[PDB]
Design a protein around this nucleic acid. Structure first.
Lengths: 76, 72, 73, 65, 72, 75, 76, 70
DNA sequence: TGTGACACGTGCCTGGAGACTAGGGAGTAATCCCCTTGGCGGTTAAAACGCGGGGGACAGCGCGTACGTGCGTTTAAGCGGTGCTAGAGCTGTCTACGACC
DNA sequence: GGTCGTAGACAGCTCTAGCACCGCTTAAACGCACGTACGCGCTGTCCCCCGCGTTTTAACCGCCAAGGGGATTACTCCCTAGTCTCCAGGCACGTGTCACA
């Protein structure tokens, strides 16, 4: 549905990363929107897995240990 | 500049609550920003490589779509 | 390690319940058992990681459930 | 499937302790995984026009799972 | 068996170009599998690049970019 | 300057490609560059495998040697 | 847990910098990150040398294993 | 001349995390040399990057960028 | 310039540095044999080398077309604090529990 | 199947770090307009790609003799990990000096 990250800060972050990789690169607005949706979906999935791990550990507050475990299980 | 902090703390909290999380540790935000930066760097590197292959100067939607396809 | 006789019995039973009139050779069952060994050792390593994450040493069914749910099953 | 074989697999996987129902759950998940891989192999064999499932069929099923 | 075209003396020539003096029997099969994996990865990347560029053939640039992805 | 016969390598590359996507043509320069890259990769892998074998007080190379070279090369 | 003591590692880093180029300032965060990366690299190198030693029908790691792992990884 | 700051127990414990069971007596000098080479590479890369960044000091992010190129 | 970041003197536990020693494992070798590999002779099953059609790579030409930048401004949302508390790390136990035959 | 050492949920138990609550701020964004440079095809051309066709190169097969690997095991024998005892840092604690936008 509606995006959860503010558009302009994410656009600026993507452009900064691109400038770090390849300078003087223009971004199509649709490409940045697709990147935004991809990042939102990835973070939503990662947080779902992290919440599953945390609830398994008999705790509600997710901790960086949970995120690390979820990433190691998923192969990242 | 250090623009990764532009991913606001309420944005990460909203993303987590979208996934069903009910409580967020204080150290979740920095780890999430690092993970997001790693994923975004990977996808942007793939998109930039695809754009360079196409002899183009503008990263279009196809480059990002193929970058996502190549990674997971 | 898994003995070849019970693995052959299990694959024959699952073939009977899925598609009869099928035959497996020694190389095919060897490849299947190698894949089984790799998959099970990976799954058990993931469940062990969940177990240490859970402040416990026993690998209960919960660890299997986690490793199956997160990995995409 | 035998319990000692599951124990050897767990020990090879870095497991130190083993529960009771884990054996049954391992049998079930192994049955499901074999069902999936045999279904993929049968689909490929129907696509490859062969009488019986071969080793290359298994390798292709794993690599295109 | 379309990979058997990579013959035993071809692998022997490759190894002796690599400085190997004596080669065991299973080395041929292991090397065949290793090269099949490497070709699968590189050709997958090359055909992905070709699909991205909207073309029906793989040119030298696609293979070069695939090898760049592989880290050659 | 090539150790793998060109035509069977073309056949193998086209077989892999048609396994990926159907009705795909190949530029001859593309296949030539791919074969050169594969030859260089295997020459490097065999150099490292011979290195492993001579490290283990051996001359004959074994699949253990290639497996170790790949394992400590990141593959 | 960091297995290299902080002060000798700081002294070594400062000595290396001074020999390479004098008048350079290092802070706690940069030195800590460098030490963590160095420890991770050394752990990986020792894992690879243990693999080489086990392959050589041996358990005691000798400098032959170190040189083998370094030259195969491409660092040498 | 302070490379000896990487003491024998430190190298032994670092190998212990690496799965090593036994360590020869000549591993320590080789490991000290390897550490000297690796820190020289990383420090030189970080210093080059931070001179390119128009700064007279080095920061943690400089080290991170230097390691990213390893 | 104000605010922030390093350098030198101490006590003490803590970790590192001298040996001693008993094994664990590294090293060299004699068979050895036997089990592969290499090399060599014959052969054949391919690869490497010449014409055609046309599929599609490649170059030039637009042309709307969408990106960069450049404001007006304003309000939803983020950032500082507090108020408040369910929740996380840490204890004792008893049936539940996994290791040995 | 049996017989013998360990422990996870429950109940607190305590501190705490996180969830609202709120005021102040601020910049994201919605809109508006512009320059223009690159995307996206149009159109045309012809490069070479695939598909067929004859001759040495070489890959296979098989056999034989050298060689080298795995293994045992003498066979010392080297020297590392554990142990013991003695000696150099390390974190707070100050007190003072140099850097930056």
């Amino acid at each position: 549905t509606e995006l959860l990250i503010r558009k302009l800060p994410f656009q600026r972050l993507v452009r900064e990363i691109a400038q770090d990789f390849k300078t003087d690169l223009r971004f199509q607005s649709s490409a940045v929107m697709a990147l935004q949706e991809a990042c939102e979906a990835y973070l939503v999935g990662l947080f779902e897995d992290t919440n599953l791990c945390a609830i398994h550990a008999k705790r509600v507050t997710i901790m960086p240990k949970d995120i690390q475990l979820a990433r190691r299980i998923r192969g990242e | 500049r250090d623009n990764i902090q532009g991913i606001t703390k309420p944005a990460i909290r909203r993303l987590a609550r979208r996934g069903g999380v009910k409580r967020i540790s204080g150290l979740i935000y920095e780890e999430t920003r690092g993970v997001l930066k790693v994923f975004l760097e990977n996808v942007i590197r793939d998109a930039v490589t695809y754009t360079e292959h196409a002899k183009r100067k503008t990263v279009t939607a196809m480059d990002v779509v193929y970058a996502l396809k190549r990674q997971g």
